[PDB]
Design a protein around this ligand. Sequence first.
Ligand SMILES: *[C@@H]1O[C@H](CO)[C@@H](O[C@@H]2O[C@H](CO)[C@@H](O[C@@H]3O[C@H](CO)[C@@H](O)[C@H](O)[C@@H]3O)[C@H](O)[C@H]2NC(C)=O)[C@H](O)[C@H]1NC(C)=O
Ligand SMILES: *[C@@H]1O[C@H](CO)[C@@H](O[C@@H]2O[C@H](CO)[C@@H](O[C@@H]3O[C@H](CO)[C@@H](O)[C@H](O)[C@@H]3O)[C@H](O)[C@H]2NC(C)=O)[C@H](O)[C@H]1NC(C)=O
Ligand SMILES: *[C@@H]1O[C@H](CO)[C@@H](O)[C@H](O)[C@H]1NC(C)=O
Ligand SMILES: *[C@@H]1O[C@H](CO)[C@@H](O)[C@H](O)[C@H]1NC(C)=O
Length: 613
Amino acid sequence: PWPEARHLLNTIAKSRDPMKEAAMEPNADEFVGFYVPMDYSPRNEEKNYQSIWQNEITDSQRHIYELLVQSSEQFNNSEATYTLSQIHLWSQYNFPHNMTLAHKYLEKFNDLTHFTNHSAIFDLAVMYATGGCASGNDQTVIPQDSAKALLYYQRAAQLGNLKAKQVLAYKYYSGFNVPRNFHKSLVLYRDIAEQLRKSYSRDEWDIVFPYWESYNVRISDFESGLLGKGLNSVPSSTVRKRTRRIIRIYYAALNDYKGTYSQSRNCERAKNLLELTYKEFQPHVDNLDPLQVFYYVRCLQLLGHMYFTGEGSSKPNIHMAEEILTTSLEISRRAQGPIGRACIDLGLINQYITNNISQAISYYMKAMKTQANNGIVEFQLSKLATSFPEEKIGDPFNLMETAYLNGFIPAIYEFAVMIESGMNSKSSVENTAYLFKTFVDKNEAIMAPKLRTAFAALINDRSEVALWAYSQLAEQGYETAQVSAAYLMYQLPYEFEDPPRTTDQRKTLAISYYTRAFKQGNIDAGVVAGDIYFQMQNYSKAMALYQGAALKYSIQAIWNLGYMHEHGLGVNRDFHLAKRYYDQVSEHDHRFYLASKLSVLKLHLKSWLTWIT
Ligand SMILES: *[C@@H]1O[C@H](CO)[C@@H](O[C@@H]2O[C@H](CO)[C@@H](O[C@@H]3O[C@H](CO)[C@@H](O)[C@H](O)[C@@H]3O)[C@H](O)[C@H]2NC(C)=O)[C@H](O)[C@H]1NC(C)=O
Ligand SMILES: *[C@@H]1O[C@H](CO)[C@@H](O[C@@H]2O[C@H](CO)[C@@H](O[C@@H]3O[C@H](CO)[C@@H](O)[C@H](O)[C@@H]3O)[C@H](O)[C@H]2NC(C)=O)[C@H](O)[C@H]1NC(C)=O
Ligand SMILES: *[C@@H]1O[C@H](CO)[C@@H](O)[C@H](O)[C@H]1NC(C)=O
Ligand SMILES: *[C@@H]1O[C@H](CO)[C@@H](O)[C@H](O)[C@H]1NC(C)=O
């Protein structure tokens, strides 16, 4: 039965990505506010499943699905049962998802060699910790079970999977259910981090971090926001830079060198395009519009970084890089333009291909205040400080401390192993842990490569699988996944029409995600949690929550606060404090000057009537 099917699943060519398909082609360059549901309708998904598995499937595509499943039930293969979980849980080939049967077959895979394969036990160990999926109406449905999942996590990390021991460390570090226990968190964090540092090369560790494309972004920022407009915080989308022929080309290659969200990147067509430009312009180099040559030499900076990169080619060329960018500075003398990244990679290639350290300090130091310096320079210097104890440069400590904050990633590890090893007792113990996770969570490719899946396999269709993915990273320390999944589980109804028509369990999960996101910083989520409990009871819990938000300077919390005391369930009714709240909103913002005193108008309109009796 099976080994014939291997030819078929070879034939079908699944696990499709659209951004790779839009990398090459001319395209709309256009997407926003695409589509979402607001109600789940469990018994609707079953009939939709029925329709699609009736019609849109192919008769062959049934034929393959026929006998792996028919052969696996007749035969104990256990390889097809593992695949169909990854097919009805991932929708990896063109088939629907059904977490009931997927969950059902996962125990079958596990029982075959109970507790050996960490890649699977983890996946259902989440499924226990939710209770929302692997659910239904038949008998085997069970709600959430903490400990029964917890043990499986311990089995995986005991076996040695990474993100398991990650989520344990986060779970202690946050005080999710168990106590705080910073010590353990430190232990397994540093363990993880040494394994990560072992994943890389010496060369690749020291010279360039390889630019894995980032998706740790807070969905609902594409639309207005988690709430409204103007009264939000920190939109994390970073897309499609822009501010006279060539400049429209310049950006048009930059976007192709680092297209981040909706179109995959690679340099090759941008590169060929670029070298065409250098072969084109160079003899025709008079003045030529000092604003144009600006973007010319900027594309030269880029270009030299690309030859030294080795993108698109089989190898990098240090040499044509050398002539081309050294030329670039030969111009940059004239018009005194930006010079940074050329000074970096020039001071870097001299540092490992040649061995004139001396000038290399001159270049690094010549570009050190540059904005493009993230942390790379300092991290590269402190090496030479610890190697060559020379007075010229200062302490390694302060330099690496100037690289930590800026975001350059290797800087953390040295900055961490330093302080823990420090016979000099620096600030504390717990802060040390904050470093390690901040490294871990930021490497983002070994640990969390599925953000490129969840996003991707959302936009075509079928949010639910992305929802499971964020429901697999929300347990990790990724705020973005928490508010993402919750924003999929509960959208805010507009004031007019209607709240949703969803499950109560589902809300019991969403609220937990929003809460943890709140205590990772996103104040707005707190507000949203309160807007759940309007529809429920627990007005006291909500009041504590809102009140928890207001102390950190929000606004909507406050209007809800005065409004909760004036109308609805208040333990004591009072409008003295109320107008204070309603007025300090206008104290702080200066922009809602009217609605404050409007609330005052209705508030005294109460008094006019009540004096009648
Ligand atoms: C997930 O997969 C299961 C299959 O394990 C799908 O199950 C179907 O569930 C219905 C009850 O909702 C079962 O009822 C059947 O009704 C027909 C008449 O319509 C009757 O002739 C059968 O004897 C039975 O009573 C149905 O047998 C069952 N079929 C299968 C293959 O399981 C379920 O619909 C899927 N859900 C989702 C959300 O994908
Ligand atoms: C849990 O079990 C699954 C199978 O149910 C294991 O899948 C195996 O994963 C490894 C890679 O981690 C695959 O290795 C590579 O496969 C390709 C062909 O697909 C081959 O060309 C490479 O040389 C290499 O052997 C392996 O084939 C794959 N096995 C099956 C049947 O798909 C999974 O690895 C197990 N979990 C863990 C954590 O290992
Ligand atoms: C390179 O080093 C040699 C000897 O170390 C020195 O003579 C030469 O001036 C250096 N060149 C540059 C460009 O720094
Ligand atoms: C109130 O909140 C608790 C959570 O502490 C929850 O278990 C309970 O179901 C809620 N009750 C109502 C009526 O909302």
